[PDB]
DNA sequence: TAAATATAATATTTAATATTAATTTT
DNA sequence: TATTATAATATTAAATATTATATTTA
DNA sequence: ATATTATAATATATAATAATAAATATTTAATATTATAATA
């Protein structure tokens, strides 16, 4: 419902912030990595925010980039992950580091973050392995298909013949020979 | 709580928006039909936002003019309609298109929109014809007749109100079914 | 959480109302008597607003004065009646004649106000017998 | 969530206030001790407020100082104390007086506050004994 | 939870009935149609039942038939139907006649039910249209396989096979009697 | 959900009871009048019961008559009436005396029932004048 | 709902128990003191039990004596006391021993109970001292 | 509140049942294996029933053995597991291979159960490996491939292969006796 | 002065589990 | 000229236990 | 001796039906009130 604020840092204190917007200063909590990048009190700062909406109390959580807020929304949409758990997470590691650790299924790099046990690593890897894949049927097979089409095979029959056996680590000329020798 | 925001389009990321008013940006989601007429980033825009209050989240839903604003709030007032349903409906086609189709009662225009199936289409038709859209924004013979019509391609509603309009009383089947066949023309 | 509003009249679509304040428009619900008191569209006018909160939405109530707002609060504090019967009551009559009527304990004048029968009229009388002062 | 509020005092009505922050005047109630520090109507006054969110209401409680707001948060964090008990504690006595008497484990200085019995006093002292090792 | 009761009737105050099952009475209502099938005070009765759990109340509903319970449950699963509406509907008309009217999708026979609006009638008919279904021995299996080989569906064959001939009859005559039917 | 309970009195701790029905003994809350109509411990007895259901507890309120259960249902069907309030109502005096009082608008006799103020008594009078409708 | 239950023991897997009362086996939890007060499996045994009602589940809490169940209900009525905590308390200590520890301000005996902090122990002290006036 | 019921099977329609326990019948939904090991309608039986409570509904899910009931309990204790998923997985297969596949970290065994995705089963592995602390041949596929390439329809050929497999005899002879079925 | 009694005001989550620090033994 | 059953609509919704402490009446 | 083309098969683009998995939406019960049709 809220995406970003242009205000003035009326007061900083770990780990929250006060952003005086037209006389109105909002309680905004930020991670330590963001806190390091912030200028002094009274400076306009670029925080892209998301509000956590709970029945008894809300939470304003801003970030210097859209990507941080979006990944925090992904982390809070998770089953057993709360907000300040993920705040500790990107306080410990950056977006590229976390993304590469997920793609490498790394646990040792991220268990240094406090509050993270083995089951924390298990749940974060199992969710983030398939929630996002790219973060911001072969050339030899096609040559074989074209060669068998020129040899008289139908394109469907050539596709079936080249998909009949899983040729690996072999040249285009020899893979046709081993596929043609395969079924026969 | 929110009706209108005299402010500038801080960001444009489909389908969401950030609309800056005095430095305050808001997470605003609008249909694609709105996105066609939305000007460049930073330009002061005209967009009637709508708040939906949940126990877990809130979102803002902008509209260019009052007519689709009222259309959206009345559609969400239905028991079966959620926000993304009406968002897809407005993204697919315009208010005049949907009202002129509903008064024509064709589901085919409704169902080509992605995420819109048949059942949603007769729900829209029935529950809008249920008083919102006047303004722009048996016996053995009759049962035998109905069964014959079902066996001859008639859907039961046109076999039903034809019987209701011209019922047959104490006389043989062949003539009131004949005048009913003249009746449905 | 909100007590008063001071902004320019964005538009006039009764019985709803939009007040454009710092470029931000608020949906407020307004009495007909206040509709007789509103200026032209585009006029900076002060509205003394009260919010009601339910589980799925909220409604504001922009008012041109205080004591009408506190009498709204006192009425809606009753479990038997909600805000919109109060809207019908306040569109029916103003503060002083309502005060003398409840002090005179008459249901008949409350009957003519639309949407109100008899039993809710003595509900208003019984409940507001001993709540407020005469001002 | 407003952590600090700085607007002009639109009107004064005990125990509440209306702070017209560029057109919007919030229903804000502050303790009487802050009311002694409150300037007249129309002055730009800075409050370190905090919103209390309920299922049917939202309440703003402004504070001229950050630490009194922090103590308000500690008091409302207690299982039996809501906003108005902490309001009575803030209005009756001063923060340093509270911390000295908690270090002194006093009870009479607490019970003498109106609306406060022996039960609430012994509560606040014994569930507050564990804290304030940091200061 | 509750699926059926086999207890003794205690008192009759229509529509509210009390069913003393082993010392404890059960607050259950039955439709006036079921009032035309209740026994006397003190007589045992078996009622097919199904409960409804509300935020502040639990309501017990018991019918003479299990199929009536299932139709009631499917009516309650509808978004605009409360128990009072379903009781009004079934107090107006009985079950299979309402089923055929749902096949008919006609509002005339259901408007006459008191307290029922026409808009309610068409919305319930449209959202209740027919998506549901319409309301072994050696010789049995041999006939089923023979009619499967003859092209008849196994469910279609079985209902013609097991209906007319008796139990453990000669396979030829019972296949003959099963194929006696026409559409 | 239970409108009648033919059980055996297992325990007698007024105003609560245990009716051991086939080894199952539920908590049974009865008024002091029903306590006078109550037999001794171990006596089989039929109580005409009512259920109250809220989000954290269920209670049983067993009565000697149908009409007692129905009247208790219609008093708790009111907005501002709790269970113990109506318990004190029929504990103070008899049912038909209550019917005569509300048909005669006798607030005084209803005031002498303990736990009942003048305001609550006249509420009961006005919301029960026409609800009985002479049966 | 349930105050007493008289049925035959089907299984004894601590802390869980099932009691086949006329074919109906209710799952129920008792303290270990009650477990050693239990007879063998297959005999009919009478318990003074209590149901805890909430939005997601319903659990039974049996006791060999009614005073144990009463003190259970009084403990659970407190905000900071839960059923697991209370069952641990009465498993560790005798009911009369608990009463004497409350009257004698014996903190350490509640401290030595596993999972119990000294804070929670002195809470138990301070609310029980004015909660029960020695029976 | 409730753990066991001992009554008489008044009615049994899958996947539910009606157990008339002392005059009161309960609709209890039980798995396919349980329905296989249940006795006929009218036979008494004792069932390990688990209490299921929602804010607006309540259910029972009974078992012939307790360990089924506790394993159902920790399955429902997971946020990401509903009752239908647990019922489907226990209806499809037995619990011993379930705990062994949890120890063996097997997924494709769980995936073949209807309604089970790869992510669902792999999550079940992820939390169950920490929850549990103490607690056909080559010729079979060759015959199917040969029949498919010969001209036979793929599923009826596998039906003939699995009707009389060559577990103790050669592939050619089991093809020979598999061609007996369709003649 | 000691409560009585409304009267009004004020207040109102829980289990259940995963981490971590201090301790304990080898 | 009132009078009453029926229906569509449009609201409104559901807390109660526990203290603190006024007058009041001895 | 080359095409050619007048009759003969053919294979798939375009109609259809059948799971299926991501994505949502998630409240009616009681009761005044007001028309309203029919009525001493």
UniProtKB/Swiss-Prot annotation, chain A:
Spell out the residue ranges making up region: Domain II: 65-136
One Pfam family, short name? RuvA_N
Q: Where is this region: Domain I?
A: 1-64
Q: What quaternary arrangement does the UniProt entry report?
A: Homotetramer. Forms an RuvA(8)-RuvB(12)-Holliday junction (HJ) complex. HJ DNA is sandwiched between 2 RuvA tetramers; dsDNA enters through RuvA and exits via RuvB. An RuvB hexamer assembles on each DNA strand where it exits the tetramer. Each RuvB hexamer is contacted by two RuvA subunits (via domain III) on 2 adjacent RuvB subunits; this complex drives branch migration. In the full resolvosome a probable DNA-RuvA(4)-RuvB(12)-RuvC(2) complex forms which resolves the HJ.
Record's miscellaneous remark: Probably part of a ruvC-ruvA-ruvB operon. Does not seem to belong to the SOS regulon, no LexA binding site has been identified in the promoter region.
GO MF terms held by the record:
ATP binding; four-way junction DNA binding; four-way junction helicase activity
Show the GO cellular component annotation of the record: cytoplasm; Holliday junction helicase complex; Holliday junction resolvase complex
Answer whether the UniProt record assigns the keyword DNA damage to this protein: yes
Q: What is this protein called?
A: Holliday junction branch migration complex subunit RuvA
The record's comment on protein family reads: Belongs to the RuvA family.
Print the keywords alphabetically.
Cytoplasm, DNA damage, DNA recombination, DNA repair, DNA-binding
User: Does the UniProt entry include the keyword Disulfide bond?
Assistant: no
Matches recorded under NCBIfam families: ruvA
Q: For the region Domain III, give the residue spans.
A: 137-184
| InterPro entries named in the record | DNA_helicase_Holl-junc_RuvA_I, Hlx-hairpin-Hlx_DNA-bd_motif, NA-bd_OB-fold, RuvA, RuvA_2-like, RuvA_C, RuvA_C_sf
Q: State the domain notes.
A: Has three domains with a flexible linker between the domains II and III and assumes an 'L' shape. Domain III is highly mobile and contacts RuvB.
Per the record, the GO terms for biological process are: DNA recombination; DNA repair; SOS response
Where is it chiefly localized?
A: cytoplasm
Q: Which HAMAP family match?
A: DNA_HJ_migration_RuvA
Q: What does this protein do?
A: The RuvA-RuvB-RuvC complex processes Holliday junction (HJ) DNA during genetic recombination and DNA repair, while the RuvA-RuvB complex plays an important role in the rescue of blocked DNA replication forks via replication fork reversal (RFR). RuvA specifically binds to HJ cruciform DNA, conferring on it an open structure. The RuvB hexamer acts as an ATP-dependent pump, pulling dsDNA into and through the RuvAB complex. HJ branch migration allows RuvC to scan DNA until it finds its consensus sequence, where it cleaves and resolves the cruciform DNA. Complements an E.coli deletion mutant.
Write out the annotated subcellular location.
Cytoplasm
From Swiss-Prot, chains C, D, F, G:
Its GO CC terms are:
cytoplasm; Holliday junction helicase complex; Holliday junction resolvase complex
Q: Name one GO biological process term.
A: DNA repair
Q: What is this protein called?
A: Holliday junction branch migration complex subunit RuvA
Q: What else is known?
A: Probably part of a ruvC-ruvA-ruvB operon. Does not seem to belong to the SOS regulon, no LexA binding site has been identified in the promoter region.
Relay the domain remarks: Has three domains with a flexible linker between the domains II and III and assumes an 'L' shape. Domain III is highly mobile and contacts RuvB.
Q: Cite the source lineage.
A: Bacteria, Pseudomonadati, Pseudomonadota, Gammaproteobacteria, Pseudomonadales
**Cell compartments where the protein resides:** Cytoplasm
Domain of life, per UniProt, equals Bacteria
Give the quaternary structure: Homotetramer. Forms an RuvA(8)-RuvB(12)-Holliday junction (HJ) complex. HJ DNA is sandwiched between 2 RuvA tetramers; dsDNA enters through RuvA and exits via RuvB. An RuvB hexamer assembles on each DNA strand where it exits the tetramer. Each RuvB hexamer is contacted by two RuvA subunits (via domain III) on 2 adjacent RuvB subunits; this complex drives branch migration. In the full resolvosome a probable DNA-RuvA(4)-RuvB(12)-RuvC(2) complex forms which resolves the HJ.
